[PDB]
Amino acid sequence: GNIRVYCRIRPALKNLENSDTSLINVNEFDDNSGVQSMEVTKIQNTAQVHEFKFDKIFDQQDTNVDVFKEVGQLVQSSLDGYNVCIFAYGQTGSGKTFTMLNPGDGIIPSTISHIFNWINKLKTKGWDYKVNCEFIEIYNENIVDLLRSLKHEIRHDQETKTTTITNVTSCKLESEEMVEIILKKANKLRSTASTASNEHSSRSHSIFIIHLSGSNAKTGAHSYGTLNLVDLAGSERINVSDRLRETQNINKSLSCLGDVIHALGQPDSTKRHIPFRNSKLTYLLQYSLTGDSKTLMFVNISPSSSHINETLNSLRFASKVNS
Ligand SMILES: Nc1ncnc2c1ncn2[C@@H]1O[C@H](COP(=O)(O)OP(=O)(O)O)[C@@H](O)[C@H]1O
Numbered sequence: 001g002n003i004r005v006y007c008r009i010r011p012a013l014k015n016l017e018n019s020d021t022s023l024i025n026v027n028e029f030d031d032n033s034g035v036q037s038m039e040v041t042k043i044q045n046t047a048q049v050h051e052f053k054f055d056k057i058f059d060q061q062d063t064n065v066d067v068f069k070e071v072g073q074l075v076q077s078s079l080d081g082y083n084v085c086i087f088a089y090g091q092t093g094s095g096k097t098f099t100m101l102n103p104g105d106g107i108i109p110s111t112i113s114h115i116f117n118w119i120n121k122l123k124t125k126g127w128d129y130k131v132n133c134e135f136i137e138i139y140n141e142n143i144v145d146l147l148r149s150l151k152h153e154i155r156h157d158q159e160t161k162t163t164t165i166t167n168v169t170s171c172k173l174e175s176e177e178m179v180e181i182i183l184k185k186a187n188k189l190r191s192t193a194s195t196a197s198n199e200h201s202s203r204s205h206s207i208f209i210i211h212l213s214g215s216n217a218k219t220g221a222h223s224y225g226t227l228n229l230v231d232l233a234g235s236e237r238i239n240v241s242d243r244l245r246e247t248q249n250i251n252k253s254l255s256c257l258g259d260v261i262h263a264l265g266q267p268d269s270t271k272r273h274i275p276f277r278n279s280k281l282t283y284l285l286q287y288s289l290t291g292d293s294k295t296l297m298f299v300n301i302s303p304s305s306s307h308i309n310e311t312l313n314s315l316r317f318a319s320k321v322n323s
C-alpha cells in the first residue's frame with residue numbers, strides 16, 4: 001500500500017499571535033518535483049532557510065471543506081476493502097482536534113457523511129454495507145473506552161488480519177445523525193471551554209475506528225475495511241524540569257510512531273525491523289498499517305513566531321517520515 005504527508009497551517013490567533021521574528025513561505029505545487037515546498041526562516045538568522053517538501057500543504061486559506069477534497073478519495077478506499085489510517089500530528093494548539101473533529105467540518109464527521117453517500121449509492125450496484133464504530137483513547141499505554149456510559153486486551157486475528165479489543169463498546173451506524181451526538185460531546189471535551197478537560201486530551205491519543213462490511217449477492221462479493229482516525233497527543237517538547245511518566249510515555253509513543261511510518265515507506269519495508277510492538281498505538285494498528293493500507297499523516301502547525309521552534313520539530317518529524 002501507500003503513505004502520504006500533508007502539512008496544514010492554521011490561521012493565526014487574533015491577538016496573542018504574530019510572525020515578527022519568523023517567516024513561513026509556501027510555494028505552489030510542482031511536477032518536476034511532484035511535491036509542494038515550504039520555507040521556514042528564523043529572523044535571528046536570515047541566511048538559514050529550512051525547506052520542507054510534502055505531498056500537499058494547506059495554508060490559512062484552505063478551510064475544513066477545503067481539506068476533505070483531498071481526503072475523500074483516500075477514505076472511499078474502505079468500500080474496497082482497504083484499511084486506512086489518518087493521523088493528526090502536532091503541538092498542542094496547532095489545530096489537531098479542529099481538523100479531526102470540528103463539527104460538521106472535521107475529518108471524522110466528513111468521513112462518515114462521505115461513506116453514507118457512497119453506501120446509499122452502492123445500493124444500486126447490489127451492495128449492502130454495514131457500519132460499526134469504536135472510540136477509544138490511549139493514555140499512558142492503557143486503553144480507555146470513550147463510548148461507555150473493564151479490562152481491554154488487544155486481539156489480533158491472523159486469519160482475518162483484523163483486530164479487536166475486549167470490552168470495548170461498539171456502535172451501529174445506520175445514519176450520520178447517530179454518531180453526531182457523540183461527536184458533540186467529543187469536541188467540547190477537547191475545547192478551550194471552561195468546563196472541558198483538554199489537559200488530559202492533550203496528553204493522549206484519541207482513536208476513532210470505523211468498520212465497513214459490505215456484501216453483494218448479484219456478485220456474491222464481500223468487502224471489509226477499517227478506518228482509524230487519530231488525534232495524536234501533543235508533540236511539544238517538554239523541558240522535563242506522573243507528569244514525568246506521562247511525558248516519557250508520549251515521547252516513546254510518537255518516536256515509535258515515527259520509526260514505524262518511516263520504515264513502512266522504505267523500499268525494503270518487508271523484512272525490515274519495524275517496532276510495531278514498541279507501543280500500544282502501533283501495536284493496535286499494525287493491520288491498518290501493513291500491506292495495502294493507506295496512511296495519511298497530517299502535520300498541524302502554528303504560524304506564529306511564538307512556536308517557531310515546535311514548528312520546526314513538527315516539520316522535522318514529518319520530514320523524517322516522508323523520506
Ligand atoms: N484550520 C483552522 N481554522 C480555524 N481555526 C482553527 C484551525 N485549526 C485550529 N483552529 C483553532 O485553533 C485553536 C486550537 O485548535 P485545536 O484543534 O484545539 O488544537 P490542538 O488539538 O492541536 O491542541 C482552536 O480555538 C481552533 O478553533
Ligand SMILES: [Mg+2]
Pocket residue numbers: 096097098190201202
Ligand atoms: Mg486537540
